[PDB]
Amino acid sequence: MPKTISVRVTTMDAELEFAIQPNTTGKQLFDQVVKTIGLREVWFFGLQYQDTKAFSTWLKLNKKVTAQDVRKESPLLFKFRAKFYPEDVSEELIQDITQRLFFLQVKEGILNDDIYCPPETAVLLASYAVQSKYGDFNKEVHKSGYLAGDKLLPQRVLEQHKLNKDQWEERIQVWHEEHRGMLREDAVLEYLKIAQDLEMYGVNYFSIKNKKGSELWLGVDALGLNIYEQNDRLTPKIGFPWSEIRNISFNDKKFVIKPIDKKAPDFVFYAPRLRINKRILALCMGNHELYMRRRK
């Protein structure tokens, strides 16, 4: 291990470079990242890395970077990403940078099908992404095919319809023209206001089984924990708002939710690995912390 360690941190739209030392903490690195990009609304964010087993891992801020399971690579690679989502972008995201980082991260998930989006909504979202990139539609510059180079729609939407690219561009262009006069920054915000109402937005999903051995999903989001049928990640089968949870715990693969009613039985589920239960508990603690902070 060297006296000076090169680090690369990638945000959704920037590659940043830093130099740390053997005793540098995660927090010290994180502080350099956010200062560099002028981000004040820092509480949603974290640094992710691939560990020595090639699993994505959040960096602990109150520990030395070198004491964590980072890989034998130089430079060390991290991704700066939102770990937590606001309950309403309009209540919490004031800065342009914060809005932009959420917009790009969310858009990535919409485009890669991670966040389900109805086709007509996907077209509307695309049109706001276009307003943000291109500004006001102008018939003199934006000739037919001006969107040909852009990936604008989820792959599922493209595959499940029989429109070609020109036909999609037509639908998107009509909406683009409707947005005339909208600031590029306002288009980003409008995109987020639409996206945040999608049922899969802001939900961390985990593969679990119940006691009967049925496959399910567990979701952790800003408001609590939810259990979903394997084939329906849009509507919870069971919901657990924070206020209704007395305790959550795990032992290896077994996860237990204890309801506030002491006479009601515990809910038991099984995750694929200990690592997943640690992820679940960490996301619950962090979301609950921010939930309370909002309401202080």
């Binding site: 509480w43 964010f45 770990k83 305790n247 508990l281 309370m292």
Partner: protein, 31 residues
């Protein structure tokens, strides 16, 4: 409110939790 004395177990009680600069990201507490 939180117990974690073994790397393979953890526990957190939401219902129990009660209430300068902009606040920092939540810190992971697990081993």
């Amino acid at each position: 409110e939180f117990r974690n004395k073994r790397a393979t177990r953890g526990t957190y009680s939401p219902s129990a939790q009660e209430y300068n600069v902009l606040k920092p990201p939540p810190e992971e507490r697990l081993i």
